[PDB]
């Protein structure tokens, strides 16, 4: 508003050229809108497995215009923020405790109160499971050639995988040694040509 | 400004001529301002092995409109810079170290104990599986007709492939001899009928 010779030489070029920029630069904006309020907004925090839109793996920091986030493999995987906010973040590691779920596959023949039973026993000697949450050991299905049990039980987020790995392998050895058997495909065949 | 008569009658006709090639032509600028962000911004440089929207293969450059990459057969693959933005971009070759899964199905009857012991074994006799990181070797499910173990082990990015390869050749190597069974899947016929 000074000088016309200042300004407006190089301002009626700048405004034109700033336009047609945010025109074809708008995703850049975007994006960097979505970056201020995720940082702004804390759905994830660096080091938290989440799942953004079908790809999980651990953040590990949100940039200007994209977060990198090292999935389990080790692949480093970029996402512009737009699609991040603009879609469901699924925190994997926010909530202290988290559930297992087993599907154990017994024969029909088999007992159920003994199953119940070796069940709730196995769940009970861990120390891992947290007692105040519910614990969970009751029939569910009955399957096509098995009967399959559902054991539901809450534990700390950290150690969530070792407790099932643990777990399942309790059940198969008392399984095993109890007397209790995982059935095989079983189909019925008859005849009637000799 | 200064005269009427050299560029107004040109400019009234650039001017449109302009503004009709960039609504049709507005694709071409999107393609350019991603081409320059990837240039700025770097998710993947030429030589890297990347996945763009389900599309991997070597990344060859990138150039004004679209980036050409080799896939693993030897077919160029021709991308648009804009959708390469819009999209996810995994990167293979980014992280050093990448991790190996190894998925053995095993006969039910077979021991437990054992097969871990061999397992860890033919691990730990490898060299170029880093030791600093973690070797899972745990029962991670009861299939069908084969319980299956897991296996874990991180490898630096360049010797991944063969480290897979040695340990499974190995690994069937050591359970043909052992004694342990890879099982075909079985089936429980049940008769009614002579
Ligand atoms: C465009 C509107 C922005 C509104 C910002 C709300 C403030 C959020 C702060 C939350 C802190 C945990
Ligand atoms: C349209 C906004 C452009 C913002 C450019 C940010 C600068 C990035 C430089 C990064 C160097 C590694």
């Known amino acids: 508003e000074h000088f016309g010779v200042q300004t407006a030489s190089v301002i009626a070029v700048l405004g034109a050229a700033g336009l047609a920029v945010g025109l074809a630069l708008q995703g850049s904006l975007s994006n960097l809108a979505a970056g201020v309020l995720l940082v ?17 793996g651990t953040v590990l920091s949100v940039q200007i215009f994209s977060t990198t986030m090292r999935t389990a493999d080790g692949k480093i995987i970029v996402i512009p923020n737009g699609k991040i906010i603009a879609g469901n973040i699924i ?7 988290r559930r297992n779920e087993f599907i ?8 159920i109160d003994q199953v119940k039973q070796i069940l709730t026993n196995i769940i009970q000697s861990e120390d ?26 809450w534990s700390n987020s950290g150690d969530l995988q070792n407790v099932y790995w643990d777990v399942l392998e309790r059940i198969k050895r008392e399984f095993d040694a109890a007397g209790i058997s995982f059935p095989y ?6 005849f009637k040509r000799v």
């Not at 080091?47 to 839109?53: A, M, P």
């Not at 050991?137 to 054991?151: K, T």
């Open 40 to 56: 702004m907004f804390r759905p994830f925090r660096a080091g938290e497995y989440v799942d953004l839109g079908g790809v999980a």
């Open 91 to 97: 925190n994997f590691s926010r909530e202290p405790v």
């Open 104 to 111: 154990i596959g017994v024969a029909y023949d088999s007992d």
């Open 128 to 153: 891992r499971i947290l007692k105040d949450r519910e614990m969970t050991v009751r029939l569910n299905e009955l399957g096509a050639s098995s009967i399959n049990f559902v054991v539901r039980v």
């Open 185 to 190: 495909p079983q189909m019925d065949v008859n």
